[PDB]
Each structure stands twice: as C-alpha cells, then as structure tokens.
Design an enzyme around this catalytic site. Structure first.
Site, mmCIF file in Angstrom:
data_model
loop_
_atom_site.group_PDB
_atom_site.id
_atom_site.type_symbol
_atom_site.label_atom_id
_atom_site.label_comp_id
_atom_site.label_asym_id
_atom_site.label_seq_id
_atom_site.Cartn_x
_atom_site.Cartn_y
_atom_site.Cartn_z
ATOM 1 N N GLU A 35 0.816 -1.209 0.000
ATOM 2 C CA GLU A 35 0.000 0.000 0.000
ATOM 3 C C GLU A 35 0.853 1.263 0.000
ATOM 4 O OE1 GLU A 35 -3.001 0.465 -0.567
ATOM 5 O OE2 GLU A 35 -3.979 -1.437 -0.112
ATOM 6 N N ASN A 46 -7.711 9.827 -5.693
ATOM 7 C CA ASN A 46 -8.481 9.074 -6.679
ATOM 8 C C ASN A 46 -9.393 10.098 -7.359
ATOM 9 O OD1 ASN A 46 -7.739 6.272 -5.642
ATOM 10 N ND2 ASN A 46 -8.643 7.213 -3.817
ATOM 11 N N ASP A 49 -13.578 9.191 -7.841
ATOM 12 C CA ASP A 49 -14.618 9.451 -6.845
ATOM 13 C C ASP A 49 -14.258 10.555 -5.846
ATOM 14 O OD1 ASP A 49 -12.804 7.951 -5.254
ATOM 15 O OD2 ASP A 49 -14.466 7.180 -4.023
ATOM 16 N N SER A 51 -11.863 10.931 -3.703
ATOM 17 C CA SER A 51 -11.451 10.508 -2.363
ATOM 18 C C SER A 51 -9.924 10.428 -2.329
ATOM 19 C CB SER A 51 -12.058 9.142 -2.004
ATOM 20 O OG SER A 51 -11.501 8.095 -2.785
ATOM 21 N N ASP A 53 -6.499 8.322 -0.304
ATOM 22 C CA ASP A 53 -6.022 7.213 0.530
ATOM 23 C C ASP A 53 -4.898 7.794 1.379
ATOM 24 O OD1 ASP A 53 -7.621 5.245 -0.824
ATOM 25 O OD2 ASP A 53 -6.228 5.448 -2.492
ATOM 26 N N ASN A 60 -8.960 4.863 2.994
ATOM 27 C CA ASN A 60 -9.780 5.765 2.191
ATOM 28 C C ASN A 60 -10.769 6.697 2.892
ATOM 29 O OD1 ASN A 60 -12.334 6.098 0.066
ATOM 30 N ND2 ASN A 60 -10.307 6.278 -0.900
#
Length: 130
Positions: A35, A46, A49, A51, A53, A60
């Site tokens: 990750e 991202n 959408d 959002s 991380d 998220n």
C-alpha cells in the site's frame, strides 16, 4: 517516516495486530508494504470518486476518516484523516482494526488480494523476532 521492515513488524505486534480478527502479522506487513512501502506520509488521490487514501495502510476518506473534501463521505473510524499521516501509527492501527471488523476483513484492501492473498507472506516477518 519510512519504517524499516522489522521495526514495523515489532511496532504492529506491540499495538496488538498479530492475529487481530484472525489476521497474522505477516499479512499486515504485506498489506503495508504494497500500500505504501511502509511510509506513513503517503497519500493517493483518486480523481474518479474524489477521495484520498492516507498513511501506511492507505485508508480511504470516503468511508474511514474525515478530510472534509470527499463528496458524501462518512467517517467510520471517527478520526481526522490527518491522524493517519502521523509518524506514530497508533491511530492508523486503531482504524485498520476498525476496517477489518467489517465482513470483508483483510480483503477490504484490493492490494492485499493482489499481492498477499494466496501467496507466501512469511518472508515479511522472518528474522524480526515476532
């Protein structure tokens, strides 16, 4: 900060992650590796959408933490996403525990399914004394 492999394995163990909801420490290590490369300051936007991380586990903002800029998001860990960017990963670990309390468990993270599931993950904790 960038954690060293064994340093992180011990930190996670001390924080009670070994076997949390049936997930071995080796799995958590593999998850963090893929990750963020064990980096606590990592963030990924991202554009799809809207959002982001955050942190070592790339948790998220649509569901887990509040950053105030993700449309229609929730805050299941009841934390500012900023708490997931600390060098001290206590809060991030508390949130990752919250994530796995949900039905999917460790499968919540696609990276785990891609790089850790049905693969030998023992190599991540070998020699760390955990």
């Amino acid at each position: 900060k960038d954690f060293e492999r064994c340093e992180l394995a011990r930190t996670l163990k001390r924080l009670g992650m070994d076997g949390y909801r049936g997930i071995s420490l080796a799995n958590w290590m593999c998850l963090a590796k893929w990750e963020s490369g064990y980096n606590t300051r990592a963030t990924n936007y991202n554009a799809g959408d809207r959002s982001t991380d955050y942190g070592i586990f790339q948790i998220n903002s649509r569901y887990w933490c509040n950053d105030g800029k993700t449309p229609g998001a929730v805050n299941a860990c009841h934390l500012s996403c900023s708490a997931l960017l600390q060098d001290n990963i206590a809060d991030a670990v508390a949130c990752a525990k919250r994530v796995v309390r949900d039905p999917q468990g460790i499968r919540a993270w696609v990276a785990w399914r891609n790089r850790c599931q049905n693969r030998d993950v023992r190599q991540y904790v070998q020699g760390c004394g955990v």
